[PDB]
Amino acid sequence: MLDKIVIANRGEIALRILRACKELGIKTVAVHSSADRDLKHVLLADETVCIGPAPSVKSYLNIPAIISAAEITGAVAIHPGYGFLSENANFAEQVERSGFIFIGPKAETIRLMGDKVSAIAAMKKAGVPCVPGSDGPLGDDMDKNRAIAKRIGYPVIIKASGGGGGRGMRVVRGDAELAQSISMTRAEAKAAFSNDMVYMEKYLENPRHVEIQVLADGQGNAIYLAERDCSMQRRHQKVVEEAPAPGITPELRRYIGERCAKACVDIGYRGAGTFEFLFENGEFYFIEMNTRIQVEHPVTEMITGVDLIKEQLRIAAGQPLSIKQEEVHVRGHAVECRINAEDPNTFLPSPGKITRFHAPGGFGVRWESHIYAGYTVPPYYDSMIGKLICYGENRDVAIARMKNALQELIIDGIKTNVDLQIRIMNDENFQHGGTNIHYLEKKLG
Ligand SMILES: Nc1ncc(C(=O)N(Cc2ccccc2)Cc2ccccc2)o1
Numbered sequence: 001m002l003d004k005i006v007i008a009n010r011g012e013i014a015l016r017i018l019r020a021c022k023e024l025g026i027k028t029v030a031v032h033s034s035a036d037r038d039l040k041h042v043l044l045a046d047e048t049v050c051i052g053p054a055p056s057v058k059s060y061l062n063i064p065a066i067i068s069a070a071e072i073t074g075a076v077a078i079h080p081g082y083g084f085l086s087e088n089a090n091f092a093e094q095v096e097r098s099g100f101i102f103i104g105p106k107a108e109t110i111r112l113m114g115d116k117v118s119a120i121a122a123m124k125k126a127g128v129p130c131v132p133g134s135d136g137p138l139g140d141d142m143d144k145n146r147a148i149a150k151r152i153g154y155p156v157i158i159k160a161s162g163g164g165g166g167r168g169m170r171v172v173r174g175d176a177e178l179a180q181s182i183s184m185t186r187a188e189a190k191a192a193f194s195n196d197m198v199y200m201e202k203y204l205e206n207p208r209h210v211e212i213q214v215l216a217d218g219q220g221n222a223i224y225l226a227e228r229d230c231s232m233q234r235r236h237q238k239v240v241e242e243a244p245a246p247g248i249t250p251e252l253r254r255y256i257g258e259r260c261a262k263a264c265v266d267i268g269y270r271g272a273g274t275f276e277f278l279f280e281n282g283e284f285y286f287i288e289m290n291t292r293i294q295v296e297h298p299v300t301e302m303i304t305g306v307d308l309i310k311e312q313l314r315i316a317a318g319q320p321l322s323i324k325q326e327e328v329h330v331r332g333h334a335v336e337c338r339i340n341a342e343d344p345n346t347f348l349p350s351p352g353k354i355t356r357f358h359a360p361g362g363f364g365v366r367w368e369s370h371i372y373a374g375y376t377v378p379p380y381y382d383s384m385i386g387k388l389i390c391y392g393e394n395r396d397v398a399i400a401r402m403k404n405a406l407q408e409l410i411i412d413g414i415k416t417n418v419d420l421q422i423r424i425m426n427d428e429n430f431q432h433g434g435t436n437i438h439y440l441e442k443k444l445g
């Protein structure tokens with residue numbers, strides 16, 4: 001087992017990782033900004049290192065500082081969590097070049113998945129179903145581009161290769177808008193990603209967002225751990241996630257899961273990863289892969305019993321997966337509600353000091369958060385301050401438990417989305433299940 005690791009993150013995920021480390025007897029180093037001295041996981045860590053002032057650029061994105069902290073403490077590995085540097089291939093490369101273990105895939109794999117065009121080509125080659133599309137970057141020849149659009153059939157969508165997570169894309173419904181749409185997506189991609197490469201896909205009007213969790217070790221084992229529906233979202237920000245995905249049969253699960261695990265083997269994948277699909281009219285279409293552990297991982301843990309962070313750490317130490325595919329069984333149902341410090345009317349971040357706090361409890365209730373009474377939510381970081389995950393023997397029990405748990409949750413002193421989450425749990429279409437990626441925005445409007 002890894003002797004000591006740096007937790008190169010903050011907030012709830014840093015605490016999640018610290019818990020996994022403690023369970024495994026791994027020493028912890030909490031690197032933190034000067035604004036984050038009183039984070040729960042910082043206070044629980046074996047060693048702490050202040051790596052910079054509040055703004056992320058000089059702390060949680062500060063590569064030299066994070067690597068120096070690993071050097072000075074005698075740490076052997078760095079877990080990037082999610083966000084920040086978790087999908088930064090150059091960081092992963094520098095970490096490994098510096099002699100430390102990066103808890104993630106090989107840097108080349110991170111780079112591959114960060115290049116949406118090359119990722120699609122790799123997945124398509126491996127036998128994973130992808131969205132009908134250009135199968136390559138679009139050039140400047142608008143006769144050729146119209147031809148590609150005709151072949152796919154309108155509506156189409158132009159996406160940035162260096163983009164992802166719903167960012168850097170626009171829908172085109174005919175020839176008249178194609179040139180300008182490509183031109184604009186390209187300009188925006190160059191500005192945001194210093195990469196003006198773009199591609200085309202068939203636009204799917206009302207899909208669900210369904211993603212498959214995988215784990216792969218360095219011994220050649222690769223497994224899938226069912227799926228998550230993350231369709232309840234607002235402006236490419238997930239709000240509620242659940243597992244398994246309603247209406248997905250064990251036969252479909254098996255079909256798509258096996259293809260994802262096959263692709264892992266083909267590409268030499270290692271660690272945790274997520275294959276994102278659009279799911280419409282009973283069909284899966286791969287859009288992108290994430291190499292990090294994600295915010296929504298806990299719902300998968302609840303329905304499979306696999307501790308995904310512990311598996312990450314085991315894999316990095318050179319241990320094989322703790323479970324075989326024939327041992328993975330979907331049992332019950334789990335729902336996650338993200339808890340955000342945000343104003344209900346503007347949806348802008350609402351930082352400040354928490355004056356009263358109470359967490360829910362009971363059977364099937366899991367609360368993932370660093371917050372406590374008297375804790376100040378800083379303005380410098382993301383608005384998500386916690387995750388409430390409820391598990392049941394079925395979806396209706398999970399939802400019932402979530403409603404009860406949301407009613408117990410007290411967070412005074414700041415504005416939160418608890419009321420919104422209660423409305424979602426009480427929503428009759430959500431209660432039916434299978435609502436699409438556009439539902440929440442329509443409901444709110
Ligand atoms: N081929 C294709 N059709 C649609 C999409 C898409 O990626 N998105 C982005 C997205 C996916 C999942 C959750 C939230 C957003 C759907 C989309 C794209 C552009 C405008 C509205 C929705 O891709």
Ligand SMILES: [Cl-]
Pocket residue numbers: 082083293294295296
């Ligand atoms: Cl994530």
